[PDB]
Amino acid sequence: YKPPDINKIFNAITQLSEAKLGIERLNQRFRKIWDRMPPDFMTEKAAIMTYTRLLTKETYNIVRMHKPETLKDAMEEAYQTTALTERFFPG
Amino acid sequence: YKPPDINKIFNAITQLSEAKLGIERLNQRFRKIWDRMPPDFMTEKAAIMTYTRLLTKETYNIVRMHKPETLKDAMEEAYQTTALTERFFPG
């Protein structure tokens, strides 16, 4: 195992924004940084919180209906509102 | 009881800085905002984290020796480095 260095991780999440083009840039880097060694970082509800306040205001309105439970649902649901009427299908 | 409204609380902590004159301004408002309805906000270590990265760099160095455990120790220890060689004694 390794030492965690938590403060860079709170530093690295702070860079992410809505200037990132579309949801796919947001969901990718957040998979990169946040999954990199959380030993026990916070509870489930608080892990929603730092994710959700980052997001765009309109996407919070549609993800209000319905509200998700985990990050995976939140990452999926905020993707699906733009994945529907837009795609390039990768392989 | 009341609805919590968590997002204002993360908004209100963001205003605090090192432009606040001395530690006493920092420790007072943080007692006001953070104690106002945390139902279960986060774990103990994470509650250290949002407190500590706010603080001044030199105060992190002295509070490194020794590192505190709870917020109360952290609020006390970062006060004591300036409460020693400076006071107006209140009543």
Curated annotation (Swiss-Prot), chains A, B:
Biological classification of the source: Eukaryota, Fungi, Dikarya, Ascomycota, Saccharomycotina
Superkingdom of source: Eukaryota
Disulfide-bond pairs as recorded: none
Gene that this polypeptide is encoded by: TY3B-I
Record's protein name: Capsid protein
Interval of the full protein contained in this chain: 105 to 195 of 1498
Protein species of origin: Saccharomyces cerevisiae (strain ATCC 204508 / S288c) (Baker's yeast)
